[model samples]
Target: MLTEGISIQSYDGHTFGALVGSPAKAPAPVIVIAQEIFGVNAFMRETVSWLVDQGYAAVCPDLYARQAPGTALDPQDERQREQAYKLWQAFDMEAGVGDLEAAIRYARHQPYSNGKVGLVGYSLGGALAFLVAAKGYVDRAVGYYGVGLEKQLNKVPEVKHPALFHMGGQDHFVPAPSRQLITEGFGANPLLQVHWYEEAGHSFAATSSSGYVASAAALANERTLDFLAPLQS
Candidate 1:
């Protein structure tokens, strides 16, 4: 696989950096990794590489490019949390979603692409995954411990393609009530599926996060791959 840093133009014509990995095979399907509040940190880069190993060209755009380029913070550091949360608070959801949409468009236009794109996001990115799915920007969508999903429940009907969501039962950021609301709210949609990891918490799938749970990550990753299999030609 070929990996490199590339520039993506946002909807407002602002260019941002993204880490990209392409398989040796030509015209492979694409998967965009939506970043957590830590930005396109090491975990996100690792995920992009793993996706490439899975035979899909992967790209992880720096969602915090507007505030700071190449933002990579330690998820476990208290000081970093201060910065991460600040970035989160400063984040413009509408613009961020547009950036993700632009990433899909860029991936689709790549010469090595199969024109099908899937999105997988963690935390804040997870929420963006759901929003972007509703906009029909990608063929498949997956969100792991997505934040604020219940707030966007009204957009559920707009999502017509297949989407998978994972929620950790012990996640404090996503309370039990919000998780229940998301589960029940999206249940009526045949194309959407939600899974719960009763023993895990936030960032359970993140390798570098303190909350990482190997079992939960393995299962969630397996489910994600299976969900995205249809995107392959």
Candidate 2:
């Protein structure tokens, strides 16, 4: 019934903000969305709404409370870039893991939710999606070009749920070894699947935005839905 933004608490009692959207249909599954470097901007927020349109309850939490609480940043601002970089470099991943877990908890208790939750994320949040999935909390997860997986490759074996990972061949942020780390670790483990888009780069799935590629996003979304089919209500 609603596609609105709200706030929720993190594990550490931080008042992190969120943008929530109810599903187009009632009594839907919940999706806890993780964010890119830019806070819970329209991309993630609208994606939450789109997931609602896809018949799921979803929320994108503000994971930057430590550095910039409730910040809706401007990508064109050079100072915003500097601040985002600073936050990214100092990001405490464990705390981040707790934050999303809290969001999952929040989503689960939502009246419209059916107690199942999926983590879907982009970029930095994408990495968080991977980590939390490996931590074994979510029912499923899908990540798009998560940049920090190389550091957490050791945790791959800990993932016990169905997961899908997407990588772009043209992505400069994730080079060869980083990409290979994922392929070697979880490529064919049966618990997860890996996809490589030959020509797409990061943000390829953001079809309404500047970095979007229609075909790549379409294919990725199709595969994502297919991966989530069993878990969806």
Candidate 3:
């Protein structure tokens, strides 16, 4: 079963919202789901529910709380799209790291969670997940086509936890050279696993996007689960 609701939490004295899902058990592993540029829409909620089915207490935090009030995405309006992109461009990694830290604290305190935490992020969220892992908060992290990550290559060497990053070879925003830079930057970290899908583009795992590829997304998810399972234990 899935539970949908919001939580009021303070971040820099500003209240933020979070969507949480608790699996029916104690000492369960927790996965913090980060949203894409589109915000935490139906697809993101569905992904959280999927995590719940996998025996994880999942929580999707509203990273756009300071900019956008709600959790839904409205892409039909060009102005909204521009506004969202602007917010994403101006997103502060430090603040996002703090927000995720708060989520980790919340998850650890949950009765259903075992105090072990993992992070799963898509698109813009993926970049934030990478930052979180670099900060050494969670046991493991998975990033899916996170944009603007190339700028943070210097921080990869600081990541101590196991991490899995998925990128689309056809992704226009982050091309092969960018992926290579990430790999080269994190070459010292043996625990990092990076995969590139030659046929998929940006947001390949997003069902709402035209680039969605079931086979690639499924394989990526399986790899991520396998990577996270041992960490959770």
Candidate 4:
């Protein structure tokens, strides 16, 4: 079952929105999906459907609830992408973490959920996933080309769960040095793993994005699926 407009209450008692897709199996494991800067758009919905087909329930939270609730910018529109950048700059990531935490809790209580919650984030959402994972809210965490993670490396030591980070070497948004900083910063943690795709760039895993790399995406998804396989039990 695919459902939209599910409301989740944050720690501050503010209500935010989420889109949910459940697998055919009842009490299935759930994954809380963090949206890119573009919000929960069509591609993200497709991702939820795909997760359902894979037998895990999915929930995508509306991180822009306070500033622009239900915001869904077109992935291919240059103007919309610019707007998304502005939105990203204005977004309060700490607050976004709180919102994501709320989403994780909501995901756990869903009728179709087995109470095991993991996270999968891309771009801005990926950064947020890194932060939330450190808080130990989710069983597993996977980030795909998460932007601004270098700036949040201080939280690296706090992460204890199995987490995976996929980065593209050619990503202009996250330069080589920044990726190095991220890797080195989290290198000491055996629970964290960072994988690199040297030829791919930002949004390499996004099917609709111009930078999408089929090979990289396939490998990254394989790794992610494998990492979260334990939750299936």
Candidate 5:
């Protein structure tokens, strides 16, 4: 059964909220679903539910726990988008990393988790996911069109765990050239896999966005599950 409204204590002494789901049997593999700039919204919850359906215990930590209350973005508004980006900039990556590590620890101790974990993130969360996996926190990782990945390439070396990166070919926020750089940088790592959706744009997997492309999202999600299943097993 899926359990919602659980709280997790991070390394920095902050209390982060999370939703967990699993059967009441031996521990299952865990997947940490990182949220986008909008915080843990409907899309993130749906992703968690999807993972639960896949038989993995999904835990989504509230990354913006320190942010002001009632602070959220209107995805359609340009001004709101800018404000959201600003808030994201204010986020302490080190703290977020600690939160992820803490989440991993929490998952390991869960009654329904096997201590094996993976990471999946969208947008800014995706960048953090890559960082965490690169730092060797998880056995598998998946990032969905993370912007500024090229700029932070030097911060992460070759990742030891298997990783899958999905990008939209038409995403202007992360140009094709920049995506190419990310692919090339990780080319030396045989565990890294990247795919570009020819028809999808930024937030294509997001149902609330105008750029949502169901077909591409479905394909990417299927590939991601296929990639993660074996790693978790």
Candidate 6:
């Protein structure tokens, strides 16, 4: 697998930096690594590498490029949450989604790509993934603990691709009502699936975090891989 930093120009001419990883083989499916509030840090880079090992071309777009290009905050830092929140507050969700769409387009045009793209995101990225999926571009989308999904429920029917959502009962950022909203509201949509990991909290899949739960991450990852398997050419 090869890994490197690259530049992506968005629909509105904003330049974003992203880490792209590809397997030894060419013409593979693309996986967009939507990041947590901490930005494209080591965790995301490792995720990109893992996806490459899984035989997919992975790209982690720096969604905070406008306010802080290439920002990679350490989750352990006491100020991490503060900085992330500040960036989030300054962020323009609509423009950020366009940048994500730009990354998808760029990935599709890469010679090593198969033109199919899937989305995988955690925390804030997870919420953004939900919105982007509804906008009708992604072939498939998997969101883990999307913090603001309930507020975006109105866009549910706009989603034309297969979607998977993961939620943890112990998650502090998203309330129980939010989880129930997704399950109850999307129950009739055959294209949508939701899973609840009763014991796993936020960042469950972040193996390096203190809150990481191997069991829950394994299950969610297994489900995600299975959901994405058909996307690989």
Which candidate's lDDT is highest?
1
The TM-scores, one per candidate, come to 0.95, 0.91, 0.90, 0.96, 0.89, 0.95
Candidate 2 stretches greater than 4 Å from native: 1-5, 208-210
Q: Per-residue lDDT tens digits of candidate 4, residues 51-94? A: 88888999998898889888888968999989898999999988
Worst 10 residues of 4 by lDDT: 1-10
The lDDT per prediction is 0.89, 0.80, 0.80, 0.88, 0.80, 0.86
Candidate 1 residues 180-214, lDDT tens each? 79889999898899999999999999878788999
Model 1, stretches more than 4 Å misplaced? Answer: 1-5
Steric clash pairs (candidate 1)? none
Question: After best superposition, candidate 3 residue 169: deviation in angstroms?
Answer: 0.8
Q: Which stretches of candidate 3 lie over 4 Å from their true place?
A: 1-11, 75-80, 231-233
lDDT of 2: 0.80
User: Mind giving the per-residue lDDT tens digits that candidate 2 earns over 137-166?
Assistant: 899999988886778777777889888888
TM-score of 5: 0.89
Alpha-carbon deviation at 116 in model 5, angstroms:
1.0
Greater lDDT among 2 and 6 belongs to: 6
Stretches of candidate 4 off by over 4 Å are: 1-5
Query: Residue-wise lDDT of candidate 5 within 47-163, one digit each (tens)?
Result: 888888877888878787777433446777899789778889898887888888888888876778787888899988788888887788888889998777888777445588788
After TM-score superposition, what is the CA distance of residue 168 in candidate 3 from its true location, in Å?
0.7
